[PDB]
Amino acid sequence: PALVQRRKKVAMIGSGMIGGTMGYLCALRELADVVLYDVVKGMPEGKALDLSHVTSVVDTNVSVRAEYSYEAALTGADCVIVTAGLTKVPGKPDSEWSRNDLLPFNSKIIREIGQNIKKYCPKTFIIVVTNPLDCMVKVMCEASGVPTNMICGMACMLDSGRFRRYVADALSVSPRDVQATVIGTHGDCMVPLVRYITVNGYPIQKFIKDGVVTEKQLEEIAEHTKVSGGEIVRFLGQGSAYYAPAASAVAMATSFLNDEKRVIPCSVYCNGEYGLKDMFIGLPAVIGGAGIERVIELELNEEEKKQFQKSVDDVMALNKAVAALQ
Amino acid sequence: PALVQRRKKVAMIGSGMIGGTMGYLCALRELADVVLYDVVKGMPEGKALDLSHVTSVVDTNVSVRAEYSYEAALTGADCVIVTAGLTKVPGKPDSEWSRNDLLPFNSKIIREIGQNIKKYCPKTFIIVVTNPLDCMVKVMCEASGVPTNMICGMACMLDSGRFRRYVADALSVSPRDVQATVIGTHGDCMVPLVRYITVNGYPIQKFIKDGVVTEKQLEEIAEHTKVSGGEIVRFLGQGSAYYAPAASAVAMATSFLNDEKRVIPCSVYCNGEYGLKDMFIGLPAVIGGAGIERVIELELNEEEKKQFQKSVDDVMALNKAVAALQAP
Amino acid sequence: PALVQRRKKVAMIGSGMIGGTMGYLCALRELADVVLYDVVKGMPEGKALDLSHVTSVVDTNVSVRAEYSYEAALTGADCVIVTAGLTKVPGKPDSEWSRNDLLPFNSKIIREIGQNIKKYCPKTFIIVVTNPLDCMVKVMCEASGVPTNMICGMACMLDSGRFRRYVADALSVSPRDVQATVIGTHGDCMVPLVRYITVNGYPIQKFIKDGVVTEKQLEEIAEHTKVSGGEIVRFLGQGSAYYAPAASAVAMATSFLNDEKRVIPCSVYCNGEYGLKDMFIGLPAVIGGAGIERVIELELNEEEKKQFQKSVDDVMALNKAVAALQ
Amino acid sequence: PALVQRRKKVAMIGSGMIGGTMGYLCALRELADVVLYDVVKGMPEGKALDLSHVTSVVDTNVSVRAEYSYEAALTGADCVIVTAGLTKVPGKPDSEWSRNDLLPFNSKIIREIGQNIKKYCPKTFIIVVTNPLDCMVKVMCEASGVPTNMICGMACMLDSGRFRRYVADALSVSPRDVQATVIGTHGDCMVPLVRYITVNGYPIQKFIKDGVVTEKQLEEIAEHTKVSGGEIVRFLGQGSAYYAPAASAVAMATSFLNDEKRVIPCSVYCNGEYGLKDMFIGLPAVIGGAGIERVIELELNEEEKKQFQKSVDDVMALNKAVAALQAP
Ligand SMILES: CC(=O)c1ccc[n+]([C@@H]2O[C@H](COP(=O)([O-])OP(=O)(O)OC[C@H]3O[C@@H](n4cnc5c(N)ncnc54)[C@H](O)[C@@H]3O)[C@@H](O)[C@H]2O)c1
Ligand SMILES: CC(=O)c1ccc[n+]([C@@H]2O[C@H](COP(=O)([O-])OP(=O)(O)OC[C@H]3O[C@@H](n4cnc5c(N)ncnc54)[C@H](O)[C@@H]3O)[C@@H](O)[C@H]2O)c1
Ligand SMILES: CC(=O)c1ccc[n+]([C@@H]2O[C@H](COP(=O)([O-])OP(=O)(O)OC[C@H]3O[C@@H](n4cnc5c(N)ncnc54)[C@H](O)[C@@H]3O)[C@@H](O)[C@H]2O)c1
Ligand SMILES: CC(=O)c1ccc[n+]([C@@H]2O[C@H](COP(=O)([O-])OP(=O)(O)OC[C@H]3O[C@@H](n4cnc5c(N)ncnc54)[C@H](O)[C@@H]3O)[C@@H](O)[C@H]2O)c1
Ligand SMILES: O=C([O-])C(=O)[O-]
Ligand SMILES: O=C([O-])C(=O)[O-]
Ligand SMILES: O=C([O-])C(=O)[O-]
Ligand SMILES: O=C([O-])C(=O)[O-]
């Protein structure tokens, strides 16, 4: 009869490794109907079929469909997750992999998508994934026109998860009980907050005194955290990480769709925090039904401010660069 | 043919509110086969049937059944969760409800159960719930004879859980991201560690400075945390809390059965921590497939040590009384 | 700021054994905000506190609270599950337990709740649990005035669940893969459809031929199914079943809230099925975002028609008794 | 202290698309520790790292590691899922994609892995995924030497899942409530049992008579089911389906590890069923803690027997050829 409860709808703009994987999580958990969009014809339909098949195997019921027009993909989307763009510069060695070099390639793609979001789903919650992340979020914000609390970028939840897993291993505890955060720009200048590491809220410092972990060891973990993306790029040979990036993005989408109010670091709009304005950078935030509801301005020690400033310079330089392109 | 992968088995010794509720969680998550045991005959069989029906409704497959003998209930249990005993003293005003008053009624029961565990499943992991919790864990340890890392009491995860829900409501965040801990003995002398509260590892002091919450609010929250049990007893009229207590005990059991190594505060054996020996008390610990794999010692400050020390005296006095009064 | 994604809200009208258990399921699964209402004061606040504490323990975030006024409990409820009423007749012996005897006591309670639903949440989905079920849904229908596709009674999913568990045990397979259905009036006249039992879609007859189970065994299971509610009443001593009943009603509400379109037997409004009109009785149905989306009319053999007619007569007499009372 | 509850361990031999995806399910659901093994160097390590990262994101705790020796990968494996092998013959047009063409490229690989299992984890439950499925299960069985109930092939759950999705869409109901099964060999000769389709036990015939679906519609659904694999091969351009295959394999692995006794059609050893001996073919079976605990023989009508006989003839032919060409 009259539909009273409508399933949530998530449009995956870009159906590569991450888009498909996020679609998988949606089908596995029955979180929402899924739309797979991409410029590559055919592939999206193959994945949609494969995913629709998953719903039977795992006894869930959501609709997964491919769409090749912006209008069909975006109309009615409660949340739009963008992964469209390149992951590596063509004809460039894995050792020279740089997220920033992707800017000239993905800038125009993010812009076009945002103009379409503005046209077809101006009230949606946008989650950007495309690199260089913090820069692409701004481009997306300017082109989409959505309120600044309704757009963010997935980056720091992934970096923090990496940070968390390494600490968890060192301590021999579930990463569920390791709170470790990475803030700043998603890249070599990201800032792992070693000082803020807690084990179920217990200061990491005590674990150092009790000899469970050493200061040197934690510093090495922070370093491993910064280069984890490039490490996977090198091991994989082709493309980059997608399982954790997909899981992080969906976690954020979920906190939004279910108004959970999780505390998740991500690339958020700056309203004066740290003296920053009209830009996006990775900071701890609360994601709820009204989108980004809080942005935490942590007190930084000398070393952290130093690293964060460099993170800020990197971002502002990238945004200057995009402004020069168009 | 031969069974190669056997389901885990959790024996609920006591099939009242909490025992039946824990049985429900196992059924809902297909966590393990469940055995319901109680001195009251008839009732656990009714709950076993009800619970077996749940498996159909939620598409899971675990066996849920009642056993009336200790031998049939305990044999083969990977984990034994004890809730057997009284929640309230007969003919006593809810205004006067006290967990310590139960000491005379539950001691004997807990001791008998431990003697049976020693007899039927000495390799099991024991999770005690029966109040007064910290004293009972010790009685259970002595009677069962299991290694000290294979036994604990469920309490602080519940107390921290309450602490967390209140903080989460004051900050408008998911309790998943509030790490608030309560240590000490489960009672009026429990120690809500207000100074240690974090929001995804971020010091609470930052939310205080930001003007989102005040120290005053936090202290009122710790006070609520402490009287949360009695509050529910008074509201309910009969019995006490069971939904969160059951979820707490099962989360601990799951961390054991799956070797998750989650960091959950519970009543654990002390062998030097905080200067305590031969006793159990609420402390942050790591629960893994080897039982209590680690007992965390926090750097308490003067005021905290004073409150913890009061908690220590209460349980030591009671343990001495129990030993003094024990039958040969 | 502006809330865009709002959690679903389910009101439990009646906070005894079943209302509290359903609240438990909502909190454990982060299914929806919960409201506990009851005529008894204090108790609902006690359970609400206990349940809110659960969210922390299992890392979910939903609001659980007690409300004493109908206006507070019902306003905004996406779904209302009614368990308000008695489970046993005061003074009557357990051996003489009957759902039909509860009619004089619960009919007035249900009618009042219906009028309050009309007033505060006419657009909600109503799931009645209070016995005598099929009769009570009718009472709720007339008093509430909601669309005929927006009200139903929970009973047969529970009866079928019991039916499936017993069959599952006889065959040594997961109940997940046993399709067993009970239709008719929730009572001694309920009709377990032995002939329609399938194991992952495979006819039960083949298993009979393979000697996995005998026809006599199936018939005894059908009988056990019929008397399961009383068997539990007798074993419990006080009250009746609540774990499976609660799970059954939440499964129904979930199929509604997420528009799953599950095929769940329940008490639904008849528009001519079996020649039944202006009444409610248990039949297989499809529950989705638009409430009862389809009612399935199975072909019945001679014995089934015979047993079903008794089911119909049972409930028609009950509805007759109610019109005489109010 | 001593570990008492050890996590389950699943070894993905072959860490391509399906192998990696199954590891994801294990990490997402905290089902078991995972070992990613492959002959391609580096790639498994990249995926293991990425999957270990997932555990933090979704708050679970299982170990995910890459292993380059058969011994490290296989020792202690409760279950081994083999996806090692080719998906398409190089240089052949997608329009000419045929699973049987893979036989000469994957048979030796499957045999080797089997030889290593016999040595390193003879008590494991083996789930083969590599095509051509039914023929590879037999090679694995002979090479590995495990009891016939401890090995099966994943295929019909996938085929049946596609079958169920299409029917569910036609009826506008959840696939959870559609029981549709495909038996026979995983290929063009697979048998979608249209006549056995039920909606929560209710026969599809009634929906035809009531005008909800048509005979042609169901026929197109059976046909669409048979060609689904190739359909995705052609759409994707490179490789073949992996999301549903992975979920089907892990669902089977889970029924074994949790002794759920789910009724899942899969490639199982035949000892008389439908008159077949010494071979594997897709049939409904019960998967539990003792591996394949029952194989269901369905009554087939004339047309079904004709089609099933056709799939039987295909696999027996191949099994014969494989044996003739096997290396000493
Ligand atoms: C911030 C962070 O943590 C993180 C982590 C991992 C990857 N990424 C980035 O996320 C992006 C996606 O990675 P991936 O999924 O592995 O990549 P990949 O598998 O290559 O898929 C990108 C997809 O987008 C498609 N595409 C290209 N142009 C367009 C366009 N105009 N409109 C729609 N689709 C288009 C492309 O055809 C392909 O299907 C890359 O830019 C990565 O660098 C970010
Ligand atoms: C530590 C903590 O956080 C916490 C929280 C809530 C309740 N509790 C305590 O946990 C216990 C159980 O709570 P409940 O389930 O609500 O209580 P309740 O519902 O009364 O059930 C206790 C059950 O144990 C049974 N019993 C009594 N004596 C024996 C015996 N000798 N052997 C076997 N069974 C027996 C009794 O018949 C009843 O079915 C009480 O002692 C509570 O105070 C502790
Ligand atoms: C159909 C089916 O399968 C099934 C299964 C089990 C129980 N039931 C019935 O479901 C109902 C609830 O069972 P229960 O929860 O176990 O029972 P119980 O635990 O007694 O709770 C019923 C609750 O409703 C309350 N109540 C009474 N009158 C009102 C009123 N006017 N307004 C609001 N609340 C009121 C009462 O105070 C109590 O808290 C009974 O009628 C049972 O017979 C049906
Ligand atoms: C039965 C069924 O339903 C089904 C469905 C989909 C795919 N499959 C088959 O499953 C297999 C794997 O598919 P995929 O994962 O998508 O493919 P793909 O991603 O290409 O991975 C196969 C992996 O195995 C590796 N490999 C090759 N030889 C060996 C060896 N000797 N030892 C260890 N690893 C080796 C190879 O390097 C690659 O990483 C193929 O044979 C498919 O045809 C079966
Ligand atoms: O951005 C990336 O590619 C990463 O960190 O995985
Ligand atoms: O011990 C108790 O009863 C409590 O805290 O709920
Ligand atoms: O209605 C009942 O009481 C039952 O069947 O459980
Ligand atoms: O076997 C296959 O590749 C399939 O059917 O997906």
**Which residues of chain C lie closer than 8 angstroms to A200, CB-CB?**
none
Cβ–Cβ below 8 Å for C206 and D284: no
DSSP state of D99: G
Best probe residue, ligand 5, of A131, A182, A190 (max atoms within 8 Å of C-beta) = A131
Q: How many CB atoms lie within 10 A of CB A28?
A: 22
Question: Collapsing DSSP states into helix, strand and coil, what is residue A267?
Answer: strand
Residue B193: what are its φ and ψ, rounded to 5°?
-80, 80
**Class of the domain covering A1-153:** alpha beta
* Residue A172 and residue B261 in contact, taking contact as beta carbons nearer than 8 Å: yes
Find all residues with CB under 8 Å of D126, minimum gap 6, and list them: D79, D80, D82, D117, D140, D144, D146, D150, D151, D152
Distance of alpha carbon A320 from alpha carbon A312, whole angstroms: 12
Q: Whose CA is nearest to atom 24 of ligand 3?
A: C84
Angle at B182 between CA B181 and CA B183, to 5 degrees: 120
**C248 in contact with ligand 7, CB cutoff 6 A:** no
- The reply to whether A211 sits in an annotated binding site is no
**C131 in contact with ligand 7, CB cutoff 6 A:** yes
Instruction: Concatenate the DSSP letters of all residues of A277-297 into one string.
Output: EEEEEEEEEEEETTEEEEE--
Find all residues with CB under 8 Å of A17, minimum gap 6, and list them: A239, A242
H or E, element range at C266: strand C262-271
* Residue C180 and residue C193 in contact, taking contact as beta carbons nearer than 8 Å: yes
The token duo for B327 is 């039958």
| Least Cα separation, residue B255 to chain D (angstroms) | 10
C30 CB near a chain A CB, below 8 Å?
A: yes
The token duo for B114 is 């431990």
Q: Whose CA is nearest to atom 9 of ligand 4?
A: D130
The token duo for C300 is 């019945």
Cβ–Cβ below 8 Å for C289 and A4: yes
**B38 in contact with ligand 2, CB cutoff 6 A:** yes
Distance of alpha carbon B234 from alpha carbon B224, whole angstroms: 14
Q: Is D172 left (phi over 0), alpha (psi -120 to 50) or beta?
A: left
C36 CB near a chain B CB, below 8 Å?
A: no
Q: How many CB atoms lie within 10 A of CB D20?
A: 26
Q: How many CB atoms lie within 10 A of CB C65?
A: 18
Angle at A18 between CA A12 and CA A20, to 5 degrees: 60
| Least Cα separation, residue B296 to chain A (angstroms) | 9
The token duo for D6 is 């050890």
D291 CB near a chain B CB, below 8 Å?
A: yes
Residue numbers of D between 222 and 241 with CB closer than 8 Å to A:
228, 231-237, 241
Which residue of chain D is at minimal alpha-carbon distance from A15? D236
* Residue A226 and residue A188 in contact, taking contact as beta carbons nearer than 8 Å: yes
Pinpoint the alpha helices (H) of chain A. Answer: 17-29, 43-57, 70-74, 103-120, 133-144, 156-171, 204-209, 215-236, 243-257, 302-325
Cβ–Cβ below 8 Å for B57 and C176: no
**B276 in contact with ligand 2, CB cutoff 6 A:** no
Interface probe for B, chosen from D7, D149, D258 (most Cβ of B below 10 Å), is: D258
Q: Is D200 left (phi over 0), alpha (psi -120 to 50) or beta?
A: left
Please report all neighbours of A, defined by 3+ CB atom pairs within 8 A.
B, C, D
Fold for domain B154-328? L-2-Hydroxyisocaproate Dehydrogenase; Chain A, domain 2 (3.90.110)
Query: For residue C289, how far is its CA from the centre of ligand 3 (angstroms)?
Result: 27
Catalytic residues of D, by residue number, are: 186
Distance of alpha carbon C323 from alpha carbon C312, whole angstroms: 17
Residue numbers of C between 55 and 84 with CB closer than 8 Å to B:
55-61
H or E, element range at C315: helix C302-325
The token duo for B235 is 């509201």
Distance of alpha carbon D266 from alpha carbon C200, whole angstroms: 13
Distance of alpha carbon D138 from alpha carbon A192, whole angstroms: 52
Which of B162-174 are b and which e, b meaning 16 or more Cβ less than 10 Å from the residue's Cβ?
bbbbbbbebbebb
H or E, element range at D294: strand D291-295
The token duo for D259 is 């002794």
Catalytic residues of A, by residue number, are: 186
**A77 in contact with ligand 5, CB cutoff 6 A:** no
**Which residues of chain D lie closer than 8 angstroms to C173, CB-CB?**
261-263, 286
Terminal-to-terminal C-alpha distance of chain A: 49
* Residue D289 and residue D259 in contact, taking contact as beta carbons nearer than 8 Å: yes
**Which residues of chain B lie closer than 8 angstroms to C235, CB-CB?**
42-43, 45-46, 49
CA dihedral A256, A260, A266, A268 (to 10 degrees): 60
Nearest beta carbon to residue C161 from set B28, B42, B57: B57
CA dihedral C303, C307, C309, C312 (to 10 degrees): -160
Distance of alpha carbon D283 from alpha carbon D133, whole angstroms: 13
* Residue D245 and residue D18 in contact, taking contact as beta carbons nearer than 8 Å: yes
Nearest beta carbon to residue A289 from set C4, C147, C257: C4
* Residue C78 and residue C257 in contact, taking contact as beta carbons nearer than 8 Å: yes
Strand partners, A126: A80, A151
Distance of alpha carbon C287 from alpha carbon C265, whole angstroms: 9
Q: How many CB atoms lie within 10 A of CB C285?
A: 26
Q: How many CB atoms lie within 10 A of CB A147?
A: 17
H or E, element range at C263: strand C262-271
Encoded amino acid at A113, one letter: I
| Least Cα separation, residue D58 to chain A (angstroms) | 7
Query: For residue A17, how far is its CA from the centre of ligand 1 (angstroms)?
Result: 8
Q: How many CB atoms lie within 10 A of CB A191?
A: 26
The token duo for A149 is 């609390």
**Burial tier of D325 (Cβ tally within 10 Å: 0-12, 13-18, 19+):** exposed
H or E, element range at A65: strand A64-67
Angle at D260 between CA D254 and CA D266, to 5 degrees: 65
Distance of alpha carbon D125 from alpha carbon D112, whole angstroms: 17
Task: Record the resolution, in angstroms.
Answer: 2.2
Angle at A217 between CA A215 and CA A223, to 5 degrees: 110
Full 3-state SS string of chain B: CCCCCCCCEEEEECCCHHHHHHHHHHHHHCCCEEEEECCCCCHHHHHHHHHHHHHHHCCCCCCEEEECCHHHHHCCCCEEEECCCCCCCCCCCHHHCCCHHHHHHHHHHHHHHHHHHHHHCCCCEEEECCCCHHHHHHHHHHHHCCCHHHEEECCHHHHHHHHHHHHHHHHCCCHHHEECCEEECCCCCCEECHHHCEECCEEHHHHHHCCCCCHHHHHHHHHHHHHHHHHHHHHHCCCCCCHHHHHHHHHHHHHHHCCCCEEEEEEEEEECHHHCEEEEEEEEEEEECCEEEEECCCCCCHHHHHHHHHHHHHHHHHHHHHHHHCCC
CA dihedral B255, B256, B261, B263 (to 10 degrees): 60
Encoded amino acid at D292, one letter: I
The single residue of B180, B186, B264, B266 carrying the catalytic annotation is B186
Q: Which ligand is nearest to the CA of C154?
A: 3
Tally of CA atoms within 13 A in the half-sphere of D175 that contains its CB:
28
Encoded amino acid at C300, one letter: L
* Residue B324 and residue D35 in contact, taking contact as beta carbons nearer than 8 Å: no
Pairing, β C125-128 against β D9-13:
unpaired
DSSP state of A273: G
Distance of alpha carbon C115 from alpha carbon C99, whole angstroms: 24
Distance of alpha carbon B218 from alpha carbon B197, whole angstroms: 10
Distance of alpha carbon D148 from alpha carbon D142, whole angstroms: 10
**D66 in contact with ligand 4, CB cutoff 6 A:** no
Interface probe for C, chosen from B53, B176, B226 (most Cβ of C below 10 Å), is: B53
Residue A291: what are its φ and ψ, rounded to 5°?
85, -140
D28 CB near a chain A CB, below 8 Å?
A: yes
Distance of alpha carbon C102 from alpha carbon C141, whole angstroms: 18
Question: Collapsing DSSP states into helix, strand and coil, what is residue C97?
Answer: coil
Distance of alpha carbon B220 from alpha carbon B211, whole angstroms: 17
Q: How many CB atoms lie within 10 A of CB D9?
A: 22
**Which residues of chain A lie closer than 8 angstroms to D233, CB-CB?**
46
Q: In which residue ranges of chain A is CATH 3.90.110.10 found? A: 154-326
Best probe residue, ligand 8, of D240, D243, D248 (max atoms within 8 Å of C-beta) = D240
Best probe residue, ligand 3, of C87, C115, C130, C163 (max atoms within 8 Å of C-beta) = C87
Angle at D193 between CA D191 and CA D198, to 5 degrees: 155
DSSP state of A258: T
Method: X-ray
The token duo for D20 is 């990696």
Q: Whose CA is nearest to atom 31 of ligand 1?
A: A109
Angle at B66 between CA B65 and CA B71, to 5 degrees: 110
Q: In which residue ranges of chain D is CATH 3.90.110.10 found? A: 154-328
**Burial tier of A215 (Cβ tally within 10 Å: 0-12, 13-18, 19+):** exposed
The token duo for D94 is 């997608």
3-state helix, strand, coil in chain C (%, to 5): 50, 20, 30
* Residue C114 and residue C144 in contact, taking contact as beta carbons nearer than 8 Å: yes
**D241 in contact with ligand 8, CB cutoff 6 A:** yes
Distance of alpha carbon A224 from alpha carbon D286, whole angstroms: 46
* Residue D133 and residue D267 in contact, taking contact as beta carbons nearer than 8 Å: yes
Terminal-to-terminal C-alpha distance of chain B: 49
Instruction: Concatenate the DSSP letters of all residues of C125-180 into one string.
Output: EEEE--SSHHHHHHHHHHHH---TTSEEE--HHHHHHHHHHHHHHHHTS-GGGEE-
The token duo for A248 is 């992080």
Find all residues with CB under 8 Å of B44, minimum gap 6, and list them: B15, B19, B36, B37, B38, B66
Residue B131: what are its φ and ψ, rounded to 5°?
-90, 155
Closest atom of ligand 3 to C106 CA is 41
Encoded amino acid at D278, one letter: D
C125 CB near a chain A CB, below 8 Å?
A: yes
Distance of alpha carbon D36 from alpha carbon D16, whole angstroms: 9
Q: In which residue ranges of chain B is CATH 3.40.50.720 found? A: 1-153
* Residue D20 and residue D36 in contact, taking contact as beta carbons nearer than 8 Å: yes
B3 CB near a chain D CB, below 8 Å?
A: yes
* Residue D64 and residue D27 in contact, taking contact as beta carbons nearer than 8 Å: yes
Distance of alpha carbon C158 from alpha carbon A191, whole angstroms: 54
Instruction: Concatenate the DSSP letters of all residues of D13-60 into one string.
Output: ES-SHHHHHHHHHHHHTT--EEEEE-SSSSHHHHHHHHHHHHHHHTT-
Question: Collapsing DSSP states into helix, strand and coil, what is residue D5?
Answer: coil
**A132 in contact with ligand 5, CB cutoff 6 A:** no
Best probe residue, ligand 7, of C136, C137, C240, C248 (max atoms within 8 Å of C-beta) = C240
- The reply to whether B169 sits in an annotated binding site is no
Q: How many CB atoms lie within 10 A of CB B73?
A: 26
Distances (CA, A) of C314 to C95, C132, C228, C307: 20, 11, 18, 11
DSSP state of D184: B
Find all residues with CB under 8 Å of D236, minimum gap 6, and list them: A42, A43, A46, A47
The token duo for B271 is 């062998």
D254 CB near a chain B CB, below 8 Å?
A: no
User: Which residues surround ligand 3 with Cβ inside 6 Å?
Assistant: C 13-19, 38-40, 83-87, 102, 106, 109, 129-131, 133, 154-155, 158, 186, 239-242, 245
H or E, element range at D278: strand D277-288
Which residue of chain B is at minimal alpha-carbon distance from A169? B261
Which residue of chain C is at minimal alpha-carbon distance from B59? C176
Encoded amino acid at A77, one letter: A
**Class of the domain covering C154-326:** alpha beta
Which of D194-231 are b and which e, b meaning 16 or more Cβ less than 10 Å from the residue's Cβ?
bebbbbbbbbbbebeeeebbeeeebeebbebbbebbbb
Tally of CA atoms within 13 A in the half-sphere of B266 that contains its CB:
32
D181 CB near a chain C CB, below 8 Å?
A: yes
**Burial tier of D264 (Cβ tally within 10 Å: 0-12, 13-18, 19+):** buried
